[PDB]
Amino acid sequence: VKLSKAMYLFHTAKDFHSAAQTLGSMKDLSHFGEIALNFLQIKDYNDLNVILIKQLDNVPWKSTQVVLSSWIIWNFMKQLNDIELKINTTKEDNLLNWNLNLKEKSNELTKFLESHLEKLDNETVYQIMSKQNRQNELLIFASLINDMKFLLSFWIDQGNWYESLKILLTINNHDLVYKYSLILLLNSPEATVSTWMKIKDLDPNKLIPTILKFFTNWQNNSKLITNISEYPENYSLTY
Amino acid sequence: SKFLFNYYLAKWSILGDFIKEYKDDFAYDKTDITNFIHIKLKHSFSKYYEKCENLKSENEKDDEFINFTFDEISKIDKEHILTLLFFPNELTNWSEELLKIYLSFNDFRSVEKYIGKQNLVAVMKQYLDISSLNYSVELVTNLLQRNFELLDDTDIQLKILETIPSVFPVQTISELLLKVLIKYQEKKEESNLRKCLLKNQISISDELSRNFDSQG
Amino acid sequence: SHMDQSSASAKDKTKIDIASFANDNPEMDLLSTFRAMTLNEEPSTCLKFLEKYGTEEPKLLQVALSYFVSNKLIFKEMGGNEVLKEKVLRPIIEGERMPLLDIIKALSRTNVAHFGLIQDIIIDHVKTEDTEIKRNEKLIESYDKELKEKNKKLKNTINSDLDIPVVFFKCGHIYHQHCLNEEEDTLESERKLFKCPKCLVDLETSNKLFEAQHEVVEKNDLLNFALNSEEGSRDRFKVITEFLGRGAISYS
C-alpha cells in the first residue's frame, strides 16, 4: 500500500522531494530498477541519491556494494557539475548560497565518504574523479585516507615547495627523499639543507652523487658570477 | 489635448560623434547602450522631451496616444537614433530589428537580450573585426562565457569552433575547450548509463519471460 | 672521473653516454638527468637522445612535451614548432600516450604557445567530437528502439497472464498471495538469504552462497584489474556500467 500510495504522487504530483522521501521509508525494495528507470528520465540527482543512499544499508555479500558506491560517488559528482554549470549560468545570493550549499554538498560528500569509508575502497574513485578535474575534492579524499604517496607527487608537480617539504618531514620512510632529493635541492637548497639537517635518519652516504651534481651545478652557476657565485656551493659545503 | 502634444512633438549632428566615441571603447562589460545614451544626455534638447515625457507619464493608459507618439517619432526620426530617447524601454510601441542600431557599434547587454539559437556565428564574426591584439580575444572569450548555454547543437558547436582565431594563445581558450570536452564526455557517459539501464531492464524482462516459461 | 668530466669539454657521444650510466638500467633516471642538464644547458640534444632511445620513452616523451616547450625562445631554438608537430605531437597522439584533456592542460601550463599547435589540437578535437556525436546518436537510436520493444514485450506478457494475483519467488517458487503466503512475517527470513522461500529446512550445511559470492568477487576484481591494465585504462567507466548491465543488482 505504501508503494502504491507513492505511485500516485510519482505519477501526478511528482514531488519527489517528499514522495521519494516517503518512498525512502520502505524497508525492503525489489523493483529498484523500475523505480530508477522512471527516476532516470526525471534527471533529479537529489532524488536518485536519496534512494541510493538508503539502499546502501543493504550490505548483502559486499563486492557489488562498490558498484553501487561508484554510482553514488558519480551521482554526487555529476550533481556538482550541474550545480557548477548552473552557478556559472548567471546572466545571485541564493546561487551563492547554493554554491555554499555545494560546499555543504561537498561537506556532505565528505560526510558521505567519512561514514562508509571502509565500505567503499577501490581507488576507482580517484580515477573517476580525476577525469572531471576538481582537484579540491581529490585533495580532501587524499587527506581522508592517510597514504600521502599520491599527495606528495601531486604537491611536487604543482610546485608547492613549502607544502612538499612539510609533507616529506612527516614521512619517515627516508627512501623517497633519498630517491627524489635532487629536484628539491635544485629548487631551493637553502630550505632543503635545513630540512635535511632537522629530519635526521638520513645517511650521508646517500645523495653523495646528488651532492656532487649539486656542486657541479653550483660551479656552473659560479662560472659567470663574482660576489655570490658560490652561494649554492656555500650552502652545500655548510650542509 | 493631444494637439499640444502634437505641437510638442513637432517642436542629428552630435549624435554621430557620440556614437563614434562610444564605439571607440571596446570593453566587454562597459556601460549599456541605454546607459551610454543616458550618460551622453546627462553630459548634454531632452527638456522638451521631458515636457513630452511629463505628458507621456500622464499617458500611461493612452494606447492610441502612445501609438500616435510612436508614429510621430518615426516621422521625426534623427539618424534613426533619437527614437531611443523617446522609447528607452518601448521597443514594441512601433526585436528582430534593434541589432541594426543596438548591435551596430557595441552593445553587450543588447546582444544578450537579442541572442538566440540562430544568428550567433554572424555576431561572433562581426565582433571579431575589432582587430585588437588581445582585447578582441578577451571580448570574444567573455561573450562565449556569458551565454555558454546558448550553444547546444553539434553542428553549431562545430561551426563556432571552426571560426576560432588562429593567432591567439591557447591559455585564453583553454577553459572553454576544457568545458566543452567535459560536457561532451558527461553527455556520452549519461547516454552510456541510460543504455546500460535499458539493457538491464530488458534483461529483467527476459528473466521474467524465462520464469513464465518455467511456470508451465 | 667527476673532476675529469668537469675539466673535459666539447665532447659529443650519445651512444657512449648511455653505456656509461654505471648500472645502465635506470633509463628513466638517465632521461631525468638529461632533462636537468638541458635545464642547465639545452642544445637540442634532447631530440637526438630521444631518437637514439625511443623505446619505453612514453614517460620521457610526456616530460619532453613540457621540457622542449618550457620557454618560447627555447622552443624557437628547438626547430621552432614543425619538428614537434611532426615528431613529438604526432607520435604521442598515435601512441595513446595520455588523455586529450591531460595534454591540453600540459600545453596550457605554458603561456607562449602559438595557435598553430592549438589549430592542430582543434582539428583533433573536431574529429573526436564528430566521433563522440556519431557514437551518441547510434546509442540513442538503439536505446529508443530497445526500450520500445521491451515495453511492448512486457505489456504483452503482463496481459497474457494457482492463478490469483501474486508475485512468484524469483528463484524457483510460486504461491498465491491470497492463500496467506503474502506477509508471512518471520523477519522475511532476512530476504530469505537471497533465495526463494523453500518453506522447509533440509540442513546439509551452507556453502553454495559463500562460494558464489567468492567467485563473483574474484571475477569482478580480475575484470577490473585486467581492464585497468588493458581494456579500461582510462577509468572503470564503460566497464563498471558493463558489469552492472550483466545483472549485478540481482533482486531474484
Task: Give the CA dihedral A89, A93, A94, A95, nearest 10 degrees.
Answer: 20
The answer to whether B74 and B94 are in contact (CB under 8 A) is yes
The three cell numbers of residue A158 are 604543482
Nearest by CB to residue B186, choosing from A81, A89, A91, is: A81
Size of interface A-C (CB pairs under 8 A): 63
Q: Do A40 and B197 touch (CB under 8 A)?
A: yes
Instruction: For chain C, give the number of residues.
Output: 252
The three cell numbers of residue A82 are 550541474
For residue B141, which of B33, B28, B25 has the smallest C-alpha distance?
Answer: B28
Q: Do A81 and B112 touch (CB under 8 A)?
A: no
- In chain A, which residues have their Cβ closer than 8 Å to the Cβ of B186? 78, 81
Helix, strand, coil % over all residues of chain B, rounded to 5:
70, 0, 30
Instruction: For chain B, give the number of residues.
Output: 216
How far apart are alpha carbons A113 and A115 in whole angstroms? 6
The answer to whether C46 and C34 are in contact (CB under 8 A) is yes
| Tally of CB atoms within 10 A around C235 | 20
Helix (H, G, I), strand (E, B) or coil at A44: coil
The answer to whether B29 and B142 are in contact (CB under 8 A) is yes
Q: Resolution in A, one decimal?
A: 4.6
How far apart are alpha carbons B52 and A36 in whole angstroms? 63
How far apart are alpha carbons A67 and A105 in whole angstroms? 22
How far apart are alpha carbons B149 and B137 in whole angstroms? 20
Q: Do A33 and B182 touch (CB under 8 A)?
A: no
Phi and psi based region of residue C167 (left: phi greater than 0; alpha: psi -120 to 50; beta: remaining): beta
How far apart are alpha carbons B150 and C69 in whole angstroms? 35
Place of cell 520493444: C149
Q: Do C224 and A28 touch (CB under 8 A)?
A: no
The answer to whether C82 and C44 are in contact (CB under 8 A) is no
- In chain B, which residues have their Cβ closer than 8 Å to the Cβ of A131? 185
Nearest by CB to residue B200, choosing from A33, A81, A132, is: A33
- How many angstroms separate the CA of residue B216 from the nearest CA in chain A? 24
3-class secondary structure per residue, A101-146:
HHHHHHHHHHHHHHHCCCCCCCCHHHHHHHCCCCHHHHHHHHHHCC
Q: Do C108 and B203 touch (CB under 8 A)?
A: no
Q: Do B166 and C238 touch (CB under 8 A)?
A: no
| Tally of CB atoms within 10 A around B49 | 17
The answer to whether B134 and B95 are in contact (CB under 8 A) is no
Distance, C-alpha A221 to centroid of its chain: 40
